[PDB]
Design a protein around this nucleic acid. Sequence first.
RNA 1: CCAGGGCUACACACGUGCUACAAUGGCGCAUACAAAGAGAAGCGACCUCGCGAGAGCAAGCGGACCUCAUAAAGUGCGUCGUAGUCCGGAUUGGAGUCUGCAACUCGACUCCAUGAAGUCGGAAUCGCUAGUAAUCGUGGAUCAGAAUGCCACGGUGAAUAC
RNA 2: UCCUCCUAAAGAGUAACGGAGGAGCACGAAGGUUGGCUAAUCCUGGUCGGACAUCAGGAGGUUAGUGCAAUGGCAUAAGCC
Lengths: 177, 65, 83, 114
Amino acid sequence: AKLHDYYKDEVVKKLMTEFNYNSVMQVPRVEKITLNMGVGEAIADKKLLDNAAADLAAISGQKPLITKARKSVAGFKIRQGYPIGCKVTLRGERMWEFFERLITIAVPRIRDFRGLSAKSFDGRGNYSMGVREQIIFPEIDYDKVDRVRGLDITITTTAKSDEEGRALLAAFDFPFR
Amino acid sequence: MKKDIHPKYEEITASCSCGNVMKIRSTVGHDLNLDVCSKCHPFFTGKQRDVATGGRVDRFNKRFN
Amino acid sequence: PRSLKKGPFIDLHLLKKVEKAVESGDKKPLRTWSRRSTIFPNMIGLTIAVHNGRQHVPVFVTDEMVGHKLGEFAPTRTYRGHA
Amino acid sequence: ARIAGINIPDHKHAVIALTSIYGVGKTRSKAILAAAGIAEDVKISELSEGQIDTLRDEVAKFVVEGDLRREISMSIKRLMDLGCYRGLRHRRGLPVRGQRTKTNARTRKGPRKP
RNA sequence: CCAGGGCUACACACGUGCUACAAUGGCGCAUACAAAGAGAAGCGACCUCGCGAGAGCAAGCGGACCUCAUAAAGUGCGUCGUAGUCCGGAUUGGAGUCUGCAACUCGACUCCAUGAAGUCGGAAUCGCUAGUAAUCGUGGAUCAGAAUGCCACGGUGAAUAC
RNA sequence: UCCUCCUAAAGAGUAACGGAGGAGCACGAAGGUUGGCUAAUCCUGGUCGGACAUCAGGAGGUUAGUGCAAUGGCAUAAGCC
């Protein structure tokens, strides 16, 4: 969307005049943004699962996919083939729309923002942030109240370092304590 | 995408209580006014105001001449 | 607490000894039985061995403790546990 | 309806629902309504946006939820870093101001379990 | 004899009380009805400032005269509409006043912020036969300061005794 | 009674009251075909979430899997959808 345009001017020109570059394919671009909602209580009750899926469809753009348990462990009393979590992956236009919605309207309401961490990065260009509560996305009616049901977002860039992806996210006017 | 299973996705025009307009595509159902936005915000402008972590020499010498 | 129209309190001997040890600069633990007297800005930079009824426990005076009194850092009733 | 800490339950009265913000009790919420001129009889249900931001700036100039949380946790932490008696009673889990601890002071130490 | 500490500690158990768990109530505002007192290194008006505890100046009174001292429930107006809630006021942080050499161990009070357990309480058990029980407030001794205890004074004032 | 390994002496076969384990079934899909896909284990980050569920990336190459014991085999996958 519009931050795709702001990327293609300002962020790519700043990363051109930040690292020594020859080609415009060296500079990283964000490939995808993945929401996870680790419900984990679907072994007990089942309607919480589809209501958490409705919350992910409300916060993100498209419908979430219910993911299944791959390895069964009795320490959380789980079984092979149970609908144990939910996830959405947005890439492209909807990813840019969700990215401008995260920056502009979501993080302002994050309830005592003392500056989110900058040591969060991966080693190959992934940021990961876990919101403690899903209210900070304004798409909820708030009149429905179910539970807390926080989620986490994982942004994946094709950057190699953490200097690379960290300065790339800092070019998107990100807070960064 | 799949053609039916997704809900509506409308471009709605929000206006921050500070005043800034934003035409964003989402799924609320109405143009909703946020209280604070990422512009004219405390931390995005620099208005965080960390506490003085002990001004006890200023406190004492303020209290007594 | 003390009213803030009266000011602070410090015993005459404690004040005079603290001023003498600040002027001559030697920073040994000076011993006192005057827990009640409040600390001052003049008093950072010196360990002081204050009374608690049995022993003189030494405290190092740092920046923060100037508003409090000297007896806050010497626990009188030593309690270790019931089992 | 949406204020910086959390929401307001929209069906209550003015000062009664304004007190539900952490950081402001009843007389200070009365001072807020005096500063906006809002009568206490109108609920938050009727309140259009003009009165809402006229409430918002006046409660912004007052101390609010998150920084007060930071201030109380930091002051307790600082007294514990000191080495005094008040921070010491904050460390152990006993009352700090001279309460009877022979039989009472149960709120500070929890249920009467063993 | 002197200085500091302890009698105030705290995994625990018991007795006696105060307070709440609420709508026969909470809160705001307005307004009415007493008695017994106490008071000189004390009792403190009226007036100035403070949200306040109070402070400053400060007449009167060894008191049926001054001073504490405004009694509150009640009565009337509106809201709250059955919720851990506009119920509860414990704990804690900050800012303060007073007294006294001194308020940290360990005083009381004011103010702001937070709002703990608690939805009438098992086995048991107590008090009470009338201006009594139950509820409401005042006062005094002790006392530099420090009552939810004690000793009094009164206001509304029942049920039952076959 | 039947199956797998060893003794069994590099074809097959070969005994003992020699050393070791399993079967008396299951499945209308766990069969046929077409199309697709590639494991186990650690490391990092991340709400509840923890040694360990979910997510993203990286090393690593079949140490994984096979409806059920063992041998042989399997990437053109015999594994998974």
